[PDB]
């Protein structure tokens, strides 16, 4: 798994470039970031739909949602045929912050990660069954630039729950393009 981190004053400058599985979590998790890795016990093979895949891990999230009983639960994954996929990540590109934690578990496909805490930025690029949770009140965004039908688990929340922006600047629009 790779992990790129840049400063806020200059993006072309990386203050921490490395690819470790443990040294990665220790870096972000050291900043209050969540980390974990779940796997299936049965042998998977021809899985055309994730509906069956999530059911194999639902038990795991079934415990997380049980306490944080969110309003609803669903997964984000459309077909690369939808032309609004790029427009969808755009409206989400705007920076923001939710009053609750934003748990994101990856099930298939690779995307991009962006955790902004204090004056620094974090960019993770690796698709493992591992997930990362963002704390409530932490500035962050989300961009899937190239999306080939990615399978991920997201929670359903209302807007009045999160605020649009704190300063109004869009720094996220800086790394919105994937690869
Ligand atoms: Ni968010």
Curated annotation (Swiss-Prot):
Known outcome of mutating residue 95 to A: Loss of dioxygenase activity and decrease in expression of soluble protein
Substrates-to-products reaction catalysed: 1,2-dihydroxy-5-(methylsulfanyl)pent-1-en-3-one + O2 = 3-(methylsulfanyl)propanoate + CO + formate + 2 H(+); 1,2-dihydroxy-5-(methylsulfanyl)pent-1-en-3-one + O2 = 4-methylsulfanyl-2-oxobutanoate + formate + 2 H(+)
Residues of the site described as May play a role in metal incorporation in vivo: 95
Main enzyme class: oxidoreductase
Entry-linked Pfam families: ARD
GO biological process: L-methionine salvage from methylthioadenosine; L-methionine salvage from S-adenosylmethionine
CDD domains: cupin_ARD
Pathway: Amino-acid biosynthesis; L-methionine biosynthesis via salvage pathway; L-methionine from S-methyl-5-thio-alpha-D-ribose 1-phosphate: step 5/6
Effect annotated for changing residue 140 to F: Strong decrease in expression of soluble protein
Annotated positions binding Ni(2+): 96, 98, 102, 140
Keyword terms: Amino-acid biosynthesis, Dioxygenase, Iron, Metal-binding, Methionine biosynthesis, Nickel, Oxidoreductase
Chain positions recorded as Fe(2+) binding sites: 96, 98, 102, 140
GO MF terms, alphabetically ordered: acireductone dioxygenase (Ni2+-requiring) activity; acireductone dioxygenase [iron(II)-requiring] activity; iron ion binding; nickel cation binding
Site description May play a role in transmitting local conformational changes, residues in chain: 101
Similarity field: Belongs to the acireductone dioxygenase (ARD) family.
Subunit details: Monomer.
Protein name stated in the entry: Acireductone dioxygenase
Organism: Klebsiella oxytoca
């Amino acid at each position: 798994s790779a992990l790129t981190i840049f400063s806020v004053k200059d993006p072309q400058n990386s203050l921490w470039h490395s690819t470790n599985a443990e040294e990665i979590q220790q870096q972000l998790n050291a900043k209050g970031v969540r980390f974990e890795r779940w796997q299936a016990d049965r042998d998977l093979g021809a899985a055309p739909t994730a509906e069956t895949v999530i059911a194999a891990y639902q038990h795991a999230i079934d415990k997380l949602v049980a306490e944080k009983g969110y309003q609803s639960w669903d997964v984000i994954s459309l077909r690369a045929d939808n032309p609004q996929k790029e427009a969808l990540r755009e409206k989400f590109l705007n920076e923001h912050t939710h009053g609750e934690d934003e748990v994101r578990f990856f099930v298939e496909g690779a995307g991009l990660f962006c955790l902004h805490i204090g004056d620094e930025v974090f960019q993770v690029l690796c698709e493992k069954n591992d997930l990362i949770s963002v704390p409530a009140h932490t500035p962050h965004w989300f961009d899937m630039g190239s999306e080939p039908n990615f399978t991920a688990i997201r929670i359903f929340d209302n807007p009045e729950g999160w605020i649009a922006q704190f300063t109004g600047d869009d720094i996220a629009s800086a790394y919105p393009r994937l690869a």
